Write a protein that binds this ligand. Structure first.
Ligand SMILES: CC[C@@H](C(=O)Nc1ccc(C(N)=O)c(F)c1)n1cc(OC)c(-c2cc(Cl)ccc2-n2cc(C(F)(F)F)nn2)cc1=O
Length: 236
């Protein structure tokens, strides 16, 4: 996250850190708890992941330094990638992880609601991007979960910024005209979380941008409301 600040214990309890264990254990991507046994994340996270066996899902983490050889984690039973996914920059950047067991919800591990049937025309004005990503282009994974508030931009404006890409109704963009706040390397897969009537909704999945927090270069997110029928199909 560029231009963000440290989160506190319990602030983003749907946020997970997805780790690979091959050839060494490291943070790969963010993700979101959407159900007892379900993480929503980005399909691109699984590039060169040989199988679900090398994945670990850590919930209730504020600082990556908490993760030690005795820290409990969820095994991944199945990675479900959208069947139209080819690469982040061409969309369908969405995946479910089915966990090997159900999360007991606590103050530090809670689900986030999907966008609600009836709110397709809600204008979300309180959206946050979170993650352990770089805080500028040339950086490293951060210890402490970072947060940043970011305004949604019109698809029409987003497409004008990315005329070499298909900015579709299945994408949503967020960014300041003069940049300074954005997702960056290591934040992908995690949530764009918008609060509406004091209820948080998973509006976006961090997917891509050209650069991090450049002017007139909004981040691009998978538009979760456009995949609610797919999510429900796979999870039910
Ligand atoms: C796998 C792709 C992933 C990534 O780089 N992951 C990653 C994880 C771990 C390490 C490590 N050191 O251990 C690492 F080096 C890289 N990714 C790609 C993006 O976009 C490619 C974005 C992005 C998303 C928005 Cl909404 C806005 C702008 C960006 N952005 C753009 C860039 C760029 F251009 F500088 F590469 N970096 N982040 C975020 C993002 O996490």
């Amino acid at each position: 996250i560029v231009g963000g600040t440290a989160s506190v214990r319990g602030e983003w309890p749907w946020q997970v850190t997805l780790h690979t264990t091959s050839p060494t254990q490291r943070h790969l991507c963010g993700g979101s708890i959407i159900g007892n046994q379900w993480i929503l994340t980005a399909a691109h996270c699984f590039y060169g992941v040989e199988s679900p066996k090398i994945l670990r899902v850590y919930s209730g983490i504020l600082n990556q330094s908490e993760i030690k050889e005795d820290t409990s984690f969820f095994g991944v039973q199945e990675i479900i990638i959208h069947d139209q996914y080819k690469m982040a920059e061409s969309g369908y950047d969405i995946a479910l992880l089915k966990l090997e067991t159900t999360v007991n919800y606590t103050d530090s591990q809670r689900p986030i609601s999907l966008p609600s049937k009836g709110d397709r025309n809600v204008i979300y004005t309180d959206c946050w991007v979170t993650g352990w990503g770089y805080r500028k282009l040339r950086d490293k994974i951060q210890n402490t979960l970072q947060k940043a508030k970011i305004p949604l931009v019109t698809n029409e404006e987003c497409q004008k910024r990315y005329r070499g890409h298909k900015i579709t109704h299945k994408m949503i963009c967020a960014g300041y005209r003069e940049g300074g706040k954005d997702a960056c390397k290591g934040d992908s897969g995690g949530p764009l979380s918008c609060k509406h009537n004091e209820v948080w909704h998973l509006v976006g999945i961090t997917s891509w941008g050209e650069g991090c927090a450049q002017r007139e270069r909004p981040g691009v997110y998978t538009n979760v409301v456009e995949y609610v029928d797919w999510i429900l199909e796979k999870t039910q």
